[PDB]
Amino acid sequence: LRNFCVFSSVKPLDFCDQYSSPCSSDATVDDGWFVCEYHASRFFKMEKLALAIPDGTGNNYYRTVGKSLVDDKAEGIERILIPSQNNYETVLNLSLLGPAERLVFYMIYDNKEKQNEICQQLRMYERFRPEVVEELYNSTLRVLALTNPNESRSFGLSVEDDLAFNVLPTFIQNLIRKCVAPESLTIGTEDLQLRNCNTCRITSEGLLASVRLYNSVQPKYLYGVNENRLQIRNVLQFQGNANALQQKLSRYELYQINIPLFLGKQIIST
Amino acid sequence: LRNFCVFSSVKPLDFCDQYSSPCSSDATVDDGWFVCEYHASRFFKMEKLALAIPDGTGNNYYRTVGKSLVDDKAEGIERILIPSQNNYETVLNLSLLGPAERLVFYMIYDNKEKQNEICQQLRMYERFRPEVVEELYNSTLRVLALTNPNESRSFGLSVEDDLAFNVLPTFIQNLIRKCVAPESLTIGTEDLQLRNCNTCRITSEGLLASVRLYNSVQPKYLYGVNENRLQIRNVLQFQGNANALQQKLSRYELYQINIPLFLGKQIIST
Amino acid sequence: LRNFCVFSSVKPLDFCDQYSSPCSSDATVDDGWFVCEYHASRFFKMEKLALAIPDGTGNNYYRTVGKSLVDDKAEGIERILIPSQNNYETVLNLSLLGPAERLVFYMIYDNKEKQNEICQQLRMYERFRPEVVEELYNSTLRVLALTNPNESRSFGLSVEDDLAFNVLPTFIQNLIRKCVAPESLTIGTEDLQLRNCNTCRITSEGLLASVRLYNSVQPKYLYGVNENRLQIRNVLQFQGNANALQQKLSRYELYQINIPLFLGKQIIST
């Protein structure tokens, strides 16, 4: 598979003489997410980060961790990172999306009736090109197949967290497992406390950025804005020169104020 | 006999259009083991070494000695070099091996009932090629025939060692005699003390590497390892440059730290 | 997939410098059996036949049907074509087969505990080549994946036949569906009565050649026989010249006396 993104198979059904998928350059690497950084940012509101664990000899074990794009001012469903099967249609706005993306989302969340309804309603597009549904269905199925199943992963000390996790679809479970790093990682015979505090939570509505931590990240795929419209809203600004703002302190190494997803514990077998 | 290995006659019963035996290049020399170095390493966990005894004129008498591949960390049946008829099935894992190798091992250890059972159960393979059992049985029998019987060989000062040796099958007895060198060899009229200490033992469970000597040998047929799997285990390493590790001392002739099999005494008649 | 046979991935674990799979020339065609004719004949005791249904314009729809190799003199388990999960180990003689074929059969019949036991017992072969289990497991899994799911198929008028069919593994169900032709096929709007009588049956022990029809087929993969052994058994022969035997009647087109597998009804949707 040259492109591992599950949304890479989405194409204009009407006419595709020359179309390029919007997947980013990371869609060609098998990091286990099966979602490119562009699509993850667009849908699940997160980016990818690499976490390196050293051993003592000079070898590094690498892991993926999600970086939350949710600001501290977001409220309600705006703080939901990955929606669950109970509210994915409302959170992702499936009615507004195109039929191909809607079918892909239905197949991801395992809605057989919706899958059949969309497939039967999409047959009239066969009159344009004879692979409107066949190749899309096959590609999505072969992408989802790779997600099917002494390392252990716990997502909280409470039973309700485990119940919320085990009711999610297999693709969503794999995405959450790959995007959420453990607070404490037991590797070999030693425990590494990556973080003593959590930043995300798993509930009946999916994976949410429950903690309202301050986020100062600049998205590299969601930075578009309409300059033609006039926006009138109060903000706060600083008065002073470099002495008052202490601009010289910028010469030091900057501490990034971001929100990586940390929750639960992980056991890595020998 | 171009190939003296007892396991050289093992072939895929189903289809053998182009099959090459895994016997090493030493299978064509009649050293008396009747087992190639590859098969000896695979089953009995030992390699072959040459021992030269000079006379005084310029002629050398050559003998074979087994080199143990068992590390000092092995425990229990992992330290068994050559299993006896009491526990050969468990040690060699006959239930996991193929029917041809299982039949060869049964014939080596003289289990007539197992031989007949395997031969009668292997008749259904005659429908592929008409020599599934006939040629294998004939080759194994003609190999075993060569092992049938004032030089003397003692394998310990205790009676129980002799009792353990004399209850072994003829093929196993010949293999042990050829692979185990004497601690003291009485040749002509003089005694040569090859080693004042023993490295192997013969008991009711066969020939074992009882002494937990340090082994630093690298097997040349058992070096395969799966690099795809991640292995997490503590080891010890040395810190320092060539001065701390004394790498310059490597210019001297190296003393090999291996475990040749030495036990008992041998009398060679004129 | 260049080779669709599920047993094509079986290789000698010890050494495979130059090994050729015994799969026949039909292993490269995707007929839906996922078992080559050689392996089907060896294990399930059947061959492949093509059945052509014309339409009226000049187009033929092709289907596969199993040809039974069981003679009318066979008794008991010798008449079992495809064993079920209740007695597959005894019928196929798994204890006599090699570890790779045994693992493949375990994975086909969905025996997770046996799969894990064989995989853990086969780790010691990693010391020869690092893909003793990994590539075999991956190939068998990707072959089995293709078998996972208004056309309908009924395998008898009794409820017990349906109960026997629905308890079989998915691979076995697909093989039975592909190898057993319907007695009556409802295609489009018309019924074609291919045969008014059945030749095979499905029970709690799998697919069996229940009807003791006379079989005069000569297997093209199971014709081996040991000419060196003397066989003494009474048979019947015909006395007479060409006039008594009516050899001249051989000039007419011969009616083949074989036993294709016919059972149930099939509905093919538009």
mmCIF file of N, CA and C in Angstrom, chain A residues 107-220:
data_model
loop_
_atom_site.group_PDB
_atom_site.id
_atom_site.type_symbol
_atom_site.label_atom_id
_atom_site.label_comp_id
_atom_site.label_asym_id
_atom_site.label_seq_id
_atom_site.Cartn_x
_atom_site.Cartn_y
_atom_site.Cartn_z
ATOM 1 N N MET A 107 -18.459 2.945 7.073
ATOM 2 C CA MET A 107 -17.736 1.680 7.120
ATOM 3 C C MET A 107 -16.758 1.648 8.288
ATOM 4 N N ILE A 108 -16.181 2.802 8.634
ATOM 5 C CA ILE A 108 -15.259 2.866 9.765
ATOM 6 C C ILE A 108 -15.985 2.538 11.065
ATOM 7 N N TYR A 109 -17.189 3.076 11.243
ATOM 8 C CA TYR A 109 -17.955 2.895 12.468
ATOM 9 C C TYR A 109 -18.869 1.676 12.426
ATOM 10 N N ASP A 110 -18.795 0.872 11.363
ATOM 11 C CA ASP A 110 -19.515 -0.399 11.260
ATOM 12 C C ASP A 110 -21.027 -0.189 11.376
ATOM 13 N N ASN A 111 -21.575 0.522 10.396
ATOM 14 C CA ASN A 111 -23.015 0.732 10.264
ATOM 15 C C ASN A 111 -23.457 0.037 8.977
ATOM 16 N N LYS A 112 -23.803 -1.250 9.096
ATOM 17 C CA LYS A 112 -24.080 -2.062 7.914
ATOM 18 C C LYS A 112 -25.279 -1.536 7.133
ATOM 19 N N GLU A 113 -26.347 -1.146 7.833
ATOM 20 C CA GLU A 113 -27.534 -0.650 7.142
ATOM 21 C C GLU A 113 -27.224 0.620 6.363
ATOM 22 N N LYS A 114 -26.491 1.551 6.979
ATOM 23 C CA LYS A 114 -26.090 2.764 6.274
ATOM 24 C C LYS A 114 -25.175 2.438 5.102
ATOM 25 N N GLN A 115 -24.276 1.467 5.279
ATOM 26 C CA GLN A 115 -23.402 1.048 4.188
ATOM 27 C C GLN A 115 -24.213 0.570 2.990
ATOM 28 N N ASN A 116 -25.182 -0.318 3.231
ATOM 29 C CA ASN A 116 -25.999 -0.834 2.137
ATOM 30 C C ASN A 116 -26.837 0.268 1.502
ATOM 31 N N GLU A 117 -27.407 1.157 2.320
ATOM 32 C CA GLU A 117 -28.225 2.237 1.778
ATOM 33 C C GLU A 117 -27.401 3.152 0.879
ATOM 34 N N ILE A 118 -26.203 3.530 1.332
ATOM 35 C CA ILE A 118 -25.345 4.396 0.530
ATOM 36 C C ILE A 118 -24.896 3.681 -0.739
ATOM 37 N N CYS A 119 -24.554 2.394 -0.632
ATOM 38 C CA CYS A 119 -24.111 1.650 -1.807
ATOM 39 C C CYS A 119 -25.218 1.545 -2.849
ATOM 40 N N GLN A 120 -26.460 1.330 -2.407
ATOM 41 C CA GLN A 120 -27.560 1.218 -3.360
ATOM 42 C C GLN A 120 -27.949 2.580 -3.923
ATOM 43 N N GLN A 121 -27.786 3.645 -3.135
ATOM 44 C CA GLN A 121 -28.080 4.983 -3.638
ATOM 45 C C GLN A 121 -26.982 5.516 -4.548
ATOM 46 N N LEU A 122 -25.781 4.949 -4.478
ATOM 47 C CA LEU A 122 -24.658 5.403 -5.287
ATOM 48 C C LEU A 122 -24.537 4.656 -6.610
ATOM 49 N N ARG A 123 -25.482 3.765 -6.923
ATOM 50 C CA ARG A 123 -25.387 2.986 -8.153
ATOM 51 C C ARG A 123 -25.591 3.845 -9.395
ATOM 52 N N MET A 124 -26.373 4.923 -9.287
ATOM 53 C CA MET A 124 -26.621 5.774 -10.446
ATOM 54 C C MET A 124 -25.359 6.471 -10.938
ATOM 55 N N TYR A 125 -24.306 6.517 -10.123
ATOM 56 C CA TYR A 125 -23.032 7.069 -10.562
ATOM 57 C C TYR A 125 -22.228 6.099 -11.418
ATOM 58 N N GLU A 126 -22.649 4.835 -11.514
ATOM 59 C CA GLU A 126 -21.967 3.884 -12.386
ATOM 60 C C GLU A 126 -22.035 4.300 -13.848
ATOM 61 N N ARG A 127 -23.004 5.141 -14.211
ATOM 62 C CA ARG A 127 -23.156 5.612 -15.580
ATOM 63 C C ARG A 127 -22.059 6.583 -16.000
ATOM 64 N N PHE A 128 -21.284 7.110 -15.052
ATOM 65 C CA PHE A 128 -20.140 7.961 -15.375
ATOM 66 C C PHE A 128 -18.870 7.131 -15.524
ATOM 67 N N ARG A 129 -18.482 6.429 -14.461
ATOM 68 C CA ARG A 129 -17.374 5.491 -14.499
ATOM 69 C C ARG A 129 -17.749 4.238 -13.719
ATOM 70 N N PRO A 130 -17.345 3.059 -14.194
ATOM 71 C CA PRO A 130 -17.820 1.805 -13.599
ATOM 72 C C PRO A 130 -17.146 1.412 -12.294
ATOM 73 N N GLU A 131 -16.398 2.304 -11.649
ATOM 74 C CA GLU A 131 -15.750 2.000 -10.377
ATOM 75 C C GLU A 131 -16.032 3.089 -9.354
ATOM 76 N N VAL A 132 -17.271 3.583 -9.312
ATOM 77 C CA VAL A 132 -17.609 4.619 -8.342
ATOM 78 C C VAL A 132 -17.635 4.049 -6.929
ATOM 79 N N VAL A 133 -18.142 2.829 -6.768
ATOM 80 C CA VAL A 133 -18.301 2.214 -5.460
ATOM 81 C C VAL A 133 -17.375 1.019 -5.277
ATOM 82 N N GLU A 134 -17.096 0.275 -6.350
ATOM 83 C CA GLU A 134 -16.355 -0.976 -6.218
ATOM 84 C C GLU A 134 -14.945 -0.739 -5.689
ATOM 85 N N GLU A 135 -14.194 0.157 -6.332
ATOM 86 C CA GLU A 135 -12.811 0.374 -5.917
ATOM 87 C C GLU A 135 -12.742 1.080 -4.568
ATOM 88 N N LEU A 136 -13.659 2.016 -4.311
ATOM 89 C CA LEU A 136 -13.690 2.686 -3.014
ATOM 90 C C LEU A 136 -13.985 1.694 -1.897
ATOM 91 N N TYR A 137 -14.992 0.841 -2.099
ATOM 92 C CA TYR A 137 -15.325 -0.172 -1.103
ATOM 93 C C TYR A 137 -14.161 -1.127 -0.882
ATOM 94 N N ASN A 138 -13.520 -1.574 -1.965
ATOM 95 C CA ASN A 138 -12.411 -2.513 -1.832
ATOM 96 C C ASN A 138 -11.232 -1.884 -1.099
ATOM 97 N N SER A 139 -10.891 -0.637 -1.440
ATOM 98 C CA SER A 139 -9.776 0.031 -0.781
ATOM 99 C C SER A 139 -10.062 0.260 0.696
ATOM 100 N N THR A 140 -11.277 0.701 1.025
ATOM 101 C CA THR A 140 -11.612 0.916 2.428
ATOM 102 C C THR A 140 -11.608 -0.398 3.201
ATOM 103 N N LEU A 141 -12.104 -1.478 2.587
ATOM 104 C CA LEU A 141 -12.091 -2.775 3.255
ATOM 105 C C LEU A 141 -10.668 -3.269 3.490
ATOM 106 N N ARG A 142 -9.788 -3.119 2.497
ATOM 107 C CA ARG A 142 -8.421 -3.596 2.677
ATOM 108 C C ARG A 142 -7.650 -2.723 3.659
ATOM 109 N N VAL A 143 -8.018 -1.446 3.784
ATOM 110 C CA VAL A 143 -7.417 -0.609 4.818
ATOM 111 C C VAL A 143 -7.904 -1.034 6.199
ATOM 112 N N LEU A 144 -9.211 -1.277 6.342
ATOM 113 C CA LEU A 144 -9.761 -1.700 7.624
ATOM 114 C C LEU A 144 -9.287 -3.086 8.036
ATOM 115 N N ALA A 145 -8.918 -3.935 7.074
ATOM 116 C CA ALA A 145 -8.466 -5.282 7.407
ATOM 117 C C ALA A 145 -7.177 -5.252 8.218
ATOM 118 N N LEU A 146 -6.281 -4.312 7.908
ATOM 119 C CA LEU A 146 -5.015 -4.219 8.626
ATOM 120 C C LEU A 146 -5.198 -3.847 10.092
ATOM 121 N N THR A 147 -6.330 -3.244 10.455
ATOM 122 C CA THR A 147 -6.583 -2.870 11.840
ATOM 123 C C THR A 147 -7.111 -4.022 12.684
ATOM 124 N N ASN A 148 -7.544 -5.116 12.064
ATOM 125 C CA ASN A 148 -8.071 -6.237 12.825
ATOM 126 C C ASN A 148 -6.943 -6.942 13.577
ATOM 127 N N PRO A 149 -7.191 -7.391 14.817
ATOM 128 C CA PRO A 149 -6.194 -8.105 15.623
ATOM 129 C C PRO A 149 -5.828 -9.463 15.028
ATOM 130 N N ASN A 150 2.731 -10.178 25.304
ATOM 131 C CA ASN A 150 2.019 -9.952 26.555
ATOM 132 C C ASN A 150 1.842 -8.461 26.826
ATOM 133 N N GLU A 151 1.838 -7.668 25.758
ATOM 134 C CA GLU A 151 1.645 -6.231 25.892
ATOM 135 C C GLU A 151 0.221 -5.925 26.337
ATOM 136 N N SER A 152 0.086 -4.939 27.221
ATOM 137 C CA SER A 152 -1.207 -4.552 27.766
ATOM 138 C C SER A 152 -1.342 -3.037 27.731
ATOM 139 N N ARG A 153 -2.588 -2.569 27.709
ATOM 140 C CA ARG A 153 -2.859 -1.136 27.681
ATOM 141 C C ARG A 153 -4.108 -0.855 28.499
ATOM 142 N N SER A 154 -3.962 -0.054 29.551
ATOM 143 C CA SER A 154 -5.073 0.370 30.386
ATOM 144 C C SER A 154 -5.307 1.862 30.193
ATOM 145 N N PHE A 155 -6.577 2.252 30.100
ATOM 146 C CA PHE A 155 -6.953 3.630 29.810
ATOM 147 C C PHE A 155 -7.667 4.281 30.990
ATOM 148 N N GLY A 156 -7.257 3.952 32.202
ATOM 149 C CA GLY A 156 -7.825 4.541 33.401
ATOM 150 C C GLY A 156 -7.985 3.511 34.501
ATOM 151 N N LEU A 157 -8.105 4.007 35.734
ATOM 152 C CA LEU A 157 -8.279 3.135 36.888
ATOM 153 C C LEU A 157 -9.736 2.773 37.137
ATOM 154 N N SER A 158 -10.669 3.386 36.415
ATOM 155 C CA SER A 158 -12.089 3.145 36.606
ATOM 156 C C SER A 158 -12.614 2.162 35.567
ATOM 157 N N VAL A 159 -13.646 1.413 35.959
ATOM 158 C CA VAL A 159 -14.222 0.400 35.078
ATOM 159 C C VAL A 159 -14.930 1.054 33.895
ATOM 160 N N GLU A 160 -15.567 2.206 34.126
ATOM 161 C CA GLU A 160 -16.328 2.859 33.066
ATOM 162 C C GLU A 160 -15.440 3.259 31.894
ATOM 163 N N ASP A 161 -14.173 3.586 32.154
ATOM 164 C CA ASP A 161 -13.254 3.902 31.064
ATOM 165 C C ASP A 161 -13.023 2.686 30.175
ATOM 166 N N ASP A 162 -12.819 1.517 30.788
ATOM 167 C CA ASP A 162 -12.655 0.295 30.009
ATOM 168 C C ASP A 162 -13.924 -0.038 29.235
ATOM 169 N N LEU A 163 -15.090 0.130 29.865
ATOM 170 C CA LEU A 163 -16.344 -0.125 29.159
ATOM 171 C C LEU A 163 -16.513 0.813 27.971
ATOM 172 N N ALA A 164 -16.147 2.085 28.137
ATOM 173 C CA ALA A 164 -16.222 3.028 27.028
ATOM 174 C C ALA A 164 -15.248 2.655 25.918
ATOM 175 N N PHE A 165 -14.065 2.153 26.279
ATOM 176 C CA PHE A 165 -13.083 1.803 25.257
ATOM 177 C C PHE A 165 -13.496 0.560 24.475
ATOM 178 N N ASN A 166 -13.991 -0.472 25.163
ATOM 179 C CA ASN A 166 -14.263 -1.743 24.499
ATOM 180 C C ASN A 166 -15.513 -1.725 23.626
ATOM 181 N N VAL A 167 -16.353 -0.688 23.717
ATOM 182 C CA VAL A 167 -17.532 -0.603 22.859
ATOM 183 C C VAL A 167 -17.258 0.151 21.566
ATOM 184 N N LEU A 168 -16.053 0.682 21.388
ATOM 185 C CA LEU A 168 -15.699 1.411 20.184
ATOM 186 C C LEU A 168 -15.389 0.452 19.039
ATOM 187 N N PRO A 169 -15.516 0.913 17.796
ATOM 188 C CA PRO A 169 -15.140 0.071 16.655
ATOM 189 C C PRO A 169 -13.649 -0.224 16.646
ATOM 190 N N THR A 170 -13.287 -1.266 15.891
ATOM 191 C CA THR A 170 -11.898 -1.712 15.856
ATOM 192 C C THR A 170 -10.977 -0.634 15.298
ATOM 193 N N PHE A 171 -11.405 0.054 14.236
ATOM 194 C CA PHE A 171 -10.594 1.134 13.683
ATOM 195 C C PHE A 171 -10.428 2.267 14.686
ATOM 196 N N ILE A 172 -11.514 2.646 15.364
ATOM 197 C CA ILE A 172 -11.438 3.704 16.364
ATOM 198 C C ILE A 172 -10.568 3.269 17.536
ATOM 199 N N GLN A 173 -10.683 2.004 17.945
ATOM 200 C CA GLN A 173 -9.848 1.495 19.028
ATOM 201 C C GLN A 173 -8.372 1.545 18.657
ATOM 202 N N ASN A 174 -8.036 1.127 17.434
ATOM 203 C CA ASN A 174 -6.647 1.176 16.989
ATOM 204 C C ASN A 174 -6.140 2.610 16.919
ATOM 205 N N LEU A 175 -6.972 3.529 16.419
ATOM 206 C CA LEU A 175 -6.568 4.928 16.342
ATOM 207 C C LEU A 175 -6.317 5.509 17.728
ATOM 208 N N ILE A 176 -7.197 5.209 18.686
ATOM 209 C CA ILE A 176 -7.016 5.707 20.045
ATOM 210 C C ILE A 176 -5.765 5.107 20.674
ATOM 211 N N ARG A 177 -5.532 3.811 20.452
ATOM 212 C CA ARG A 177 -4.346 3.165 21.001
ATOM 213 C C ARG A 177 -3.070 3.773 20.433
ATOM 214 N N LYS A 178 -3.061 4.074 19.133
ATOM 215 C CA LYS A 178 -1.867 4.626 18.504
ATOM 216 C C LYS A 178 -1.662 6.101 18.827
ATOM 217 N N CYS A 179 -2.738 6.848 19.079
ATOM 218 C CA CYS A 179 -2.627 8.291 19.257
ATOM 219 C C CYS A 179 -2.516 8.721 20.713
ATOM 220 N N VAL A 180 -2.829 7.846 21.664
ATOM 221 C CA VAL A 180 -2.792 8.176 23.084
ATOM 222 C C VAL A 180 -1.610 7.450 23.711
ATOM 223 N N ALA A 181 -0.689 8.220 24.306
ATOM 224 C CA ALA A 181 0.482 7.691 24.986
ATOM 225 C C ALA A 181 0.171 7.411 26.453
ATOM 226 N N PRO A 182 0.837 6.432 27.056
ATOM 227 C CA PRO A 182 0.585 6.135 28.469
ATOM 228 C C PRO A 182 1.246 7.149 29.387
ATOM 229 N N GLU A 183 0.583 7.409 30.516
ATOM 230 C CA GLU A 183 1.191 8.246 31.545
ATOM 231 C C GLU A 183 2.424 7.576 32.136
ATOM 232 N N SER A 184 2.344 6.272 32.388
ATOM 233 C CA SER A 184 3.468 5.485 32.875
ATOM 234 C C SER A 184 3.622 4.261 31.986
ATOM 235 N N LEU A 185 4.838 4.028 31.503
ATOM 236 C CA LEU A 185 5.129 2.923 30.599
ATOM 237 C C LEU A 185 6.058 1.940 31.296
ATOM 238 N N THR A 186 5.587 0.714 31.492
ATOM 239 C CA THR A 186 6.411 -0.352 32.058
ATOM 240 C C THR A 186 7.080 -1.087 30.905
ATOM 241 N N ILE A 187 8.372 -0.842 30.715
ATOM 242 C CA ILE A 187 9.138 -1.462 29.643
ATOM 243 C C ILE A 187 10.202 -2.349 30.274
ATOM 244 N N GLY A 188 10.350 -3.558 29.738
ATOM 245 C CA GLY A 188 11.276 -4.517 30.302
ATOM 246 C C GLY A 188 10.961 -4.820 31.750
ATOM 247 N N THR A 189 11.806 -4.327 32.653
ATOM 248 C CA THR A 189 11.592 -4.482 34.082
ATOM 249 C C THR A 189 11.492 -3.157 34.822
ATOM 250 N N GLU A 190 11.461 -2.026 34.118
ATOM 251 C CA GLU A 190 11.443 -0.724 34.767
ATOM 252 C C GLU A 190 10.276 0.120 34.268
ATOM 253 N N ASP A 191 9.784 0.979 35.158
ATOM 254 C CA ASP A 191 8.688 1.889 34.869
ATOM 255 C C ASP A 191 9.245 3.270 34.554
ATOM 256 N N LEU A 192 8.782 3.857 33.455
ATOM 257 C CA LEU A 192 9.123 5.219 33.073
ATOM 258 C C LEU A 192 7.873 6.075 33.217
ATOM 259 N N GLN A 193 7.934 7.068 34.101
ATOM 260 C CA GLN A 193 6.804 7.965 34.337
ATOM 261 C C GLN A 193 6.909 9.115 33.344
ATOM 262 N N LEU A 194 6.283 8.936 32.178
ATOM 263 C CA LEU A 194 6.304 9.983 31.161
ATOM 264 C C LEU A 194 5.578 11.236 31.632
ATOM 265 N N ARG A 195 4.464 11.074 32.339
ATOM 266 C CA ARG A 195 3.732 12.207 32.883
ATOM 267 C C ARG A 195 2.903 11.729 34.066
ATOM 268 N N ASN A 196 2.914 12.509 35.144
ATOM 269 C CA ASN A 196 2.140 12.186 36.337
ATOM 270 C C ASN A 196 0.694 12.656 36.252
ATOM 271 N N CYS A 197 0.311 13.310 35.159
ATOM 272 C CA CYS A 197 -1.027 13.857 35.005
ATOM 273 C C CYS A 197 -1.533 13.525 33.610
ATOM 274 N N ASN A 198 -2.851 13.431 33.475
ATOM 275 C CA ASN A 198 -3.475 13.104 32.202
ATOM 276 C C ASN A 198 -3.952 14.366 31.490
ATOM 277 N N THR A 199 -4.069 14.262 30.166
ATOM 278 C CA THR A 199 -4.524 15.365 29.335
ATOM 279 C C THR A 199 -5.772 15.049 28.525
ATOM 280 N N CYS A 200 -6.139 13.777 28.386
ATOM 281 C CA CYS A 200 -7.315 13.383 27.625
ATOM 282 C C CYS A 200 -8.106 12.366 28.431
ATOM 283 N N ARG A 201 -9.348 12.137 28.011
ATOM 284 C CA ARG A 201 -10.239 11.225 28.710
ATOM 285 C C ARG A 201 -11.030 10.427 27.682
ATOM 286 N N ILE A 202 -11.444 9.223 28.069
ATOM 287 C CA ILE A 202 -12.276 8.364 27.234
ATOM 288 C C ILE A 202 -13.605 8.166 27.946
ATOM 289 N N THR A 203 -14.695 8.554 27.284
ATOM 290 C CA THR A 203 -16.030 8.426 27.856
ATOM 291 C C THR A 203 -16.988 7.807 26.848
ATOM 292 N N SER A 204 -18.279 7.773 27.187
ATOM 293 C CA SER A 204 -19.276 7.184 26.300
ATOM 294 C C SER A 204 -19.384 7.928 24.976
ATOM 295 N N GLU A 205 -18.916 9.173 24.916
ATOM 296 C CA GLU A 205 -18.918 9.955 23.690
ATOM 297 C C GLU A 205 -17.566 9.947 22.987
ATOM 298 N N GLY A 206 -16.651 9.070 23.397
ATOM 299 C CA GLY A 206 -15.385 8.925 22.703
ATOM 300 C C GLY A 206 -14.198 9.526 23.428
ATOM 301 N N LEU A 207 -13.168 9.894 22.673
ATOM 302 C CA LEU A 207 -11.960 10.484 23.235
ATOM 303 C C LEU A 207 -12.085 12.002 23.205
ATOM 304 N N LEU A 208 -11.991 12.626 24.377
ATOM 305 C CA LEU A 208 -12.187 14.057 24.539
ATOM 306 C C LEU A 208 -10.981 14.681 25.227
ATOM 307 N N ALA A 209 -10.722 15.947 24.897
ATOM 308 C CA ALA A 209 -9.704 16.740 25.586
ATOM 309 C C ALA A 209 -10.360 17.376 26.809
ATOM 310 N N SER A 210 -10.555 16.548 27.839
ATOM 311 C CA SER A 210 -11.291 16.985 29.021
ATOM 312 C C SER A 210 -10.569 18.115 29.746
ATOM 313 N N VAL A 211 -9.250 18.021 29.864
ATOM 314 C CA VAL A 211 -8.479 19.033 30.574
ATOM 315 C C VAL A 211 -8.365 20.278 29.705
ATOM 316 N N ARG A 212 -8.728 21.427 30.273
ATOM 317 C CA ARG A 212 -8.706 22.700 29.554
ATOM 318 C C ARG A 212 -7.328 23.357 29.666
ATOM 319 N N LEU A 213 -6.316 22.612 29.232
ATOM 320 C CA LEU A 213 -4.959 23.135 29.216
ATOM 321 C C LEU A 213 -4.816 24.204 28.139
ATOM 322 N N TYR A 214 -3.938 25.167 28.398
ATOM 323 C CA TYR A 214 -3.684 26.219 27.424
ATOM 324 C C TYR A 214 -2.942 25.651 26.222
ATOM 325 N N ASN A 215 -3.437 25.958 25.026
ATOM 326 C CA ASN A 215 -2.853 25.477 23.780
ATOM 327 C C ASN A 215 -2.374 26.670 22.970
ATOM 328 N N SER A 216 -1.103 26.650 22.583
ATOM 329 C CA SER A 216 -0.497 27.708 21.784
ATOM 330 C C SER A 216 0.102 27.141 20.503
ATOM 331 N N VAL A 217 -0.537 26.119 19.951
ATOM 332 C CA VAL A 217 -0.059 25.460 18.743
ATOM 333 C C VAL A 217 -0.683 26.135 17.528
ATOM 334 N N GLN A 218 0.087 26.217 16.448
ATOM 335 C CA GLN A 218 -0.402 26.766 15.189
ATOM 336 C C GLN A 218 -0.597 25.633 14.194
ATOM 337 N N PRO A 219 -1.834 25.266 13.859
ATOM 338 C CA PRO A 219 -2.041 24.182 12.893
ATOM 339 C C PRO A 219 -1.433 24.518 11.540
ATOM 340 N N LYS A 220 -0.814 23.516 10.923
ATOM 341 C CA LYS A 220 -0.189 23.670 9.618
ATOM 342 C C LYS A 220 -1.079 23.200 8.475
#
